[PDB]
Ligand binder design. Structure first.
Ligand code: AGS
Ligand code: AGS
Lengths: 373, 424, 27, 106, 326
């Protein structure tokens, strides 16, 4: 029963039909349309263009069109080095890849005059690099300039996450210049183009690959906040091993991990009634909305416990251990914040994820914290 | 590898293996698991599929330290050697600079020492070109996230290549880590597996202790009465009271649920009975024994109880004179942070507001060490010294200023216990 | 077109003679 | 044997790498080690973070102080008194020391 | 303090602004503009004659002078001087001062390569040797035959990088050399604050007015105002999930039910119940996670009831209602 679901985990898209119109001159060897391909994240958009060019290169005339990933540069030189790697040649590399005018000499081909288009992968690392109008916008500016006179032009295909980048362009560039205009976006496929690809990615079909309306149910009730349904099939591939482990069932398993302690399991964290007392003690110190030290909390803990004698006053060292019991369940977090007297000195400020509405319910059942409120 | 041959020496003069020595040998933190039994499969069945199908996935586990996530994934790969992969422990905190892990990967594919720059070029050249198997553990991921997230994007972008022979296993501190430090673009690549590890429970904390106490609980030793040496003249036995082991469990599962903390509090409580046994008979270093409940009562408290209260009452007089002046200003002004000159202003005033009493033998000594020749000191004797002594002790805290009057002073421990320890 | 790139170089009297005998002589 | 002076400065906020490696050498190494942190920052244990303190065997020992006036008086007697015979002056010198020390008005 | 504000203005999008701006700057006062340009054309022989005296020529005046300098330097002067000395004509090195990315090292590295490398001047390249290397250039040039070999142009001399003081003194030592003619323009009203009698001694500036009331097309690009957030988050909503549009629509209604300030906002509990009422929000976490996406792109605010409020104006939210949400 394994080998049917061993193969489970692994032209084709209805977005490739768009881009061949957008590359309408790429089979007639002319300069194509003006390509700035954006997208909200997770939407397949990195592999989307990679699907096109791999279908382009396997289809396509002299054949040399290269694509490089802009991740580890922070600087516009070695991209123009990596276009030279499809030549397998040798030259003086440093000057030719550095200046704007130095790129222009690089664009005279050798063997058969096939035009070249570059593909700039993950442009947002250089967009969201160092300060905008100094280097990175200038880097954006310099690449999109295609004023070259022969039709051999370095057509850009760049990609980005957040859609602020168009308004970042200068008003000269927004005057119908370069690869600007066609701001081709990709709205996140709800279930209406992505699930059908999963259907065709179920070409080798096992018998029980589950009631597919539940798969449709999975698609409809994941599409609130999602972009990657194969990865959201990779959460089906984990639950398909649950039915192997036991020889949207799992989204139900995963949300109760996150929703609880405020409604119900707050009292699970405080089986000690003193842990209930010390939890209200933190919030009474939160009146002075300050750097809530473990000492200022201990200050209000003593000066209240001398008034109402519910228990004896305990140690600060005990007060250290008891607040860590509050910590490991995930209620209150402790951080070493800032005080700048001698050096960067670290006093510990706490923060609570509970509200007084979710407090007042669980304390009226216990009239021993009622003196303390 | 090499130098372990040189770490061996010859003369080992018959070390006394006492009663409690053989406990601590197995109470060492080294040597199937009861608590995370089924979740071992949830890793492994997630891992067994990708391994025998030549894919590239991601597995994300979280949890507080002391829950076995350092341990369990080592047990995953260990049995897999019986049944194609290269195991690497890419620890985050064991990298000096964060880019230094890049050097390890390119070292651990062919054996070359190249740039973190030049490594990741050939790494990227590996991960999209090789025709068709690498297991990598990205431990303690708080270290490698800090600078600008450009490292962390790489370690999951390599997973996206369908021609990438790699299997990554991330182990973090918190589940929140790709939601409060990383971007959403990484959070798409992290997936939504998210195998949560909770704490241990106190029943299972009993079930983890006896795994170390398998062949030695209530067993028998062969002992000579002259040297205290035990052998697995009397034939004595040693028993472990399980209720004291239980009360060790019901605290550590309550506060932390940490597997090191449970073993070590048993390990600390074991040696308390060791010295008391050596106290009564003195076998040195060259009818039925047990470990009481009263041992783990002390040693668990020994994790808690302080001494700054006992430190303060065992300090100097002018130290206790200093703090008593300091709380007097904090109840005079209610500003919790007083100027240094006002304290020197106060300790002058706190002399003569008391009567002409012992205070005079103090007030003689407080401004001159006897020696009526040299006198008329402005600030008190060793005032720089006690203020330096209260500074490096951590009780006080004083901001830096070249003015020795208006530099502010802030307390660092709770001022009530300062008030409370002053009463003695 | 190129003006946003900084510092790009490019490679594109009967009366006055009586001034010329006077100017340099002064200088 | 490790001898660490001012281990608190290693316990900074940012990295804490070197502490994390030696404390894990307690857990796994066949080579028997022992670590000796010496410091003066009193609450050293809160200065550590979580993942290092769980490696730590939690046993600290506080250093004593002269708790009574009589203690250092007993100390200075053991400090100045010579017990080995070197000089003819020694037996005369030893009783001069305590006679100053025995008198509370000296 | 009832003040009319730029937020309370009928705003204009990107393509609408720049096109009708391009209509004015090429058709408003076209006839008198070239009518000025023909009048000042007769001054061009006068500039040629004075520039033989090594005079640093400086152009002030209202309006942009960028077009005028490039006509005067490139087409008119630079071949006229090459013909009058007797072959490629005189090299023109412009300096775009409105471009803030001008440094002192890079432009001078061009200069010593533009000027003659007759000696090993890279030996004196050593650590600031720039004033050192130009001093060895100056005294050699005192004993050369007097002829211009280079004319440089510095547009917008009060620019964001050229007005820096270590760059200004660098140009001062260039101007004392007789072989190079220095034709620059500034636009600031406090431009003669830049020079003392030390530098003007090295400069010997003369002045001329040119006021053509040009629109400064290139010089407007780097500059920005609030035309160049209410407009920022106007584009993110156009690419999201369809549910975020609806949960912002229910957000924007009761936040405009009551400028858009804090007081019109809503509590988190009821808004959870309101977005539970239309079968949208499952609970607090599923609400907040796709509300952090509105938080991450700074599209909504929260202050303290637990009030979440939109920081856009009263007029803006109904514009966000009828256009992008509907
Ligand atoms: N419509 C689709 N057709 C084919 N494969 C798809 C499709 N949608 C998603 N995938 C696959 O699932 C993956 C999920 O996309 P991600 O790579 O996580 O996001 P992305 O491709 O990086 O785009 P971003 O996040 O904007 S950079 C893609 O890379 C593809 O491998
Ligand atoms: N279920 C178990 N069975 C046996 N021994 C265990 C078990 N859980 C933990 N231990 C032991 O306790 C040690 C605790 O280390 P781990 O919990 O694996 O590390 P951890 O949980 O990752 O904490 P870190 O590494 O600081 S994040 C292990 O190295 C084992 O020696």
């Amino acid at each position: 029963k394994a080998l049917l679901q061993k193969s489970s985990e692994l032209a084709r898209t209805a977005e490739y039909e768009q881009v061949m119109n957008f590359l309408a001159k790429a089979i007639s060897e002319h300069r194509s349309d003006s390509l700035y391909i954006t997208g909200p994240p997770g939407t397949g958009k990195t592999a989307q263009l990679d699907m096109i060019i791999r279908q382009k290169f396997q289809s396509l005339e002299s054949v040399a069109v290269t694509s490089i990933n802009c991740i580890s540069l922070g600087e516009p030189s070695s991209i123009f080095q990596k276009i030279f790697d499809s030549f397998q040649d040798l030259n003086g590399p440093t000057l030719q890849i550095k200046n704007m005018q130095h790129l222009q000499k690089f664009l005279e081909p050798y063997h058969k005059k096939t035009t070249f288009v570059v593909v700039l992968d993950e442009m947002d690392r250089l967009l969201h690099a160092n300060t905008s109008e100094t280097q990175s916008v200038r880097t954006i500016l310099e690449l999109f300039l295609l004023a070259k006179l022969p039709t051999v032009s370095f057509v850009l295909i760049g990609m980005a996450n957040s859609l602020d980048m168009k308004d970042r362009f200068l008003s000269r560039l927004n005057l119908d210049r370069g690869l600007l205009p066609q701001t081709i976006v990709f709205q996140p496929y709800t279930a209406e183009q992505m699930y059908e690809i999963v259907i065709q990615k179920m070409s080798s079909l096992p018998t029980i690959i589950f009631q597919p309306m539940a798969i449709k149910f999975a698609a409809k009730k994941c599409a609130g906040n999602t972009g990657d349904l194969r990865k959201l099939f990779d959460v089906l591939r984990g639950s398909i091993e649950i039915y192997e482990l036991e020889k949207l069932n799992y989204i139900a398993k995963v949300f109760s991990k996150f929703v609880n302690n405020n409604s119900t399991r707050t009292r699970i964290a405080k089986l000690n009634i003193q842990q209930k007392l010390i939890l209200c003690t933190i919030i009474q110190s939160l009146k002075l909305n300050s750097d809530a030290t473990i000492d200022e909390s201990f200050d209000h803990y003593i000066k209240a416990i001398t008034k109402t004698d519910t228990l004896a006053p305990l140690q600060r060292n005990e007060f250290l251990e008891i607040c860590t019991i509050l910590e490991t369940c995930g209620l209150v977090s402790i951080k070493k914040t800032k005080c700048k007297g001698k050096t960067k000195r670290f006093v510990d400020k706490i923060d609570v994820d509970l509200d007084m509405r979710e407090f007042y319910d669980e304390m009226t059942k216990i009239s021993i914290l009622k003196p303390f409120l | 590898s090499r130098f372990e041959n040189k770490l061996k020496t010859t003369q080992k003069h018959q070390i006394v293996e006492t009663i409690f020595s053989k406990v601590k040998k197995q109470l060492n933190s080294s040597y199937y698991l009861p608590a995370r039994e089924n979740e071992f499969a949830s890793i492994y069945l997630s891992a067994y599929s990708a391994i025998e199908s030549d894919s590239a996935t991601t597995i994300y586990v979280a949890g507080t330290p002391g829950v076995g996530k350092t341990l369990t994934v080592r047990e995953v790969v260990k049995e897999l050697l019986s049944s194609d992969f290269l195991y690497v422990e890419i620890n985050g905190l064991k990298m000096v600079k964060p880019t230094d892990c890049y050097e390890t990967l390119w070292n651990k594919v062919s054996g070359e020492r190249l740039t973190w720059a030049a490594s990741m070029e050939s790494l990227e050249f590996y991960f999209k070109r090789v025709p068709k198997t690498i297991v990598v553990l990205l431990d303690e991921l708080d270290a490698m996230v800090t600078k600008s997230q450009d490292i962390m994007y790489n370690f999951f972008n390599w997973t996206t290549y369908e021609n990438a022979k790699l299997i990554v296993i991330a182990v973090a501190n918190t589940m929140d880590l790709p939601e409060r430090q990383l971007g959403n673009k990484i959070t798409s690549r992290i997936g939504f597996t998210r195998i949560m590890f909770t704490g241990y429970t106190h029943e299972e904390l009993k079930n983890i202790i006896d795994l170390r106490l398998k062949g030695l609980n209530d067993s028998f030793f062969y002992v000579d009465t002259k040297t205290g040496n035990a052998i697995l003249v009397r034939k004595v036995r040693l028993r472990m009271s399980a209720d004291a082991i239980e009360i060790a469990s019901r605290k550590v599962a309550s506060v932390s649920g940490d597997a090191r903390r449970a073993l070590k509090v048993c390990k600390r409580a074991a040696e308390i009975a060791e010295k008391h046994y050596m106290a009564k008979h003195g076998y040195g270093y060259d009818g039925v024994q047990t470990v009481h409940i009263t041992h783990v009562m002390k040693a668990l408290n020994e994790t808690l109880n302080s001494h700054v209260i006992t430190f303060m009452t065992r300090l100097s007089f002018t130290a206790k004179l200093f703090i008593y002046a300091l709380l007097n200003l904090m109840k005079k002004n209610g500003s919790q942070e007083q100027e240094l000159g006002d304290i020197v202003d106060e300790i002058k005033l706190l002399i003569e507001v008391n009567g002409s009493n012992f205070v005079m033998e103090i007030a003689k000594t407080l401004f001159q060490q006897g020696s009526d020749n040299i006198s008329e000191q402005l600030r008190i004797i060793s005032w720089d010294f006690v203020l330096n002594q209260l500074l490096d002790a951590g009780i006080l805290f004083k901001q830096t200023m070249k003015n020795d009057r208006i530099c502010c002073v802030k307390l660092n421990i709770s001022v009530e216990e300062a008030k409370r320890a002053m009463n003695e | 077109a190129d003006a946003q790139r900084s510092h790009y170089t490019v490679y594109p009297e009967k009366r006055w003679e009586l001034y010329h005998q006077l100017h340099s002589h002064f200088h | 044997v490790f001898i660490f002076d001012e281990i608190d400065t290693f316990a900074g906020p940012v990295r804490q790498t070197l502490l994390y490696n030696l404390f894990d050498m307690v857990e796994h190494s066949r080579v028997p080690v022992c670590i000796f942190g010496c410091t003066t920052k009193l609450n050293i244990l809160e200065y550590l973070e979580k993942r290092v303190k769980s490696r730590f065997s939690q046993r600290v020992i506080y250093m004593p102080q002269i708790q009574n006036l009589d203690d250092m008086v007993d100390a200075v007697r053991n400090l100045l008194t010579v017990r080995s015979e070197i000089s003819p002056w020694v037996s005369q010198w030893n009783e001069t020391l305590e006679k100053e020390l025995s008198d509370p008005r000296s | 303090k009832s003040r009319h504000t730029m937020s309370m203005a009928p705003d204009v999008t990107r393509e609408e602004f720049s096109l009708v701006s391009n209509f004015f700057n090429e058709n408003f006062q076209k006839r008198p503009r070239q009518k000025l340009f023909e009048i000042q054309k007769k001054m061009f022989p006068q500039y040629w004659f004075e520039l033989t005296q090594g005079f640093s020529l400086l152009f002030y005046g209202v309006g942009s002078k960028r077009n005028f300098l490039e006509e005067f330097a490139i087409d008119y002067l630079s071949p006229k001087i090459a013909y009058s000395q007797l072959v490629n004509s005189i090299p023109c090195l412009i300096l775009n001062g409105y471009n803030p990315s001008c440094n002192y090292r890079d432009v001078f590295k061009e200069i010593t390569d533009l000027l003659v490398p007759a000696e090993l001047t890279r030996s004196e390249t050593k650590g600031n040797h720039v004033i050192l290397q130009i001093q060895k250039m100056i005294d050699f040039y005192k004993n050369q035959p007097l002829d211009i070999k280079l004319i440089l142009v510095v547009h917008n001399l009060d620019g964001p990088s050229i007005r820096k003081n270590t760059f200004q003194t660098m140009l001062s030592f260039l101007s004392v050399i007789r072989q190079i003619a220095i034709v620059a323009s500034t636009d600031h009203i406090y431009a003669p604050l830049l020079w003392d009698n030390m530098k003007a001694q090295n400069y010997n500036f003369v002045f001329h007015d040119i006021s053509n009331f040009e629109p400064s097309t290139v010089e407007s690009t780097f500059q920005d105002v609030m035309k160049m957030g209410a407009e920022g988050a106007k584009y993110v909503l156009q690419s999201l999930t369809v549910n975020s549009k609806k949960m912002y629509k229910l957000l924007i209604e009761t936040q405009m039910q009551n400028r858009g300030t804090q007081r019109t906002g809503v509590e988190l509990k009821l808004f959870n119940h309101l977005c539970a009422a239309d079968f949208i929000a499952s609970n607090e976490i599923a609400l907040r996670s796709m509300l952090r996406e509105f938080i991450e792109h700074k599209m909504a605010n929260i202050t303290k009831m637990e009030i979440i409020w939109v920081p856009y104006t009263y007029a803006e939210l109904e514009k966000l209602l009828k256009t992008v949400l509907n």
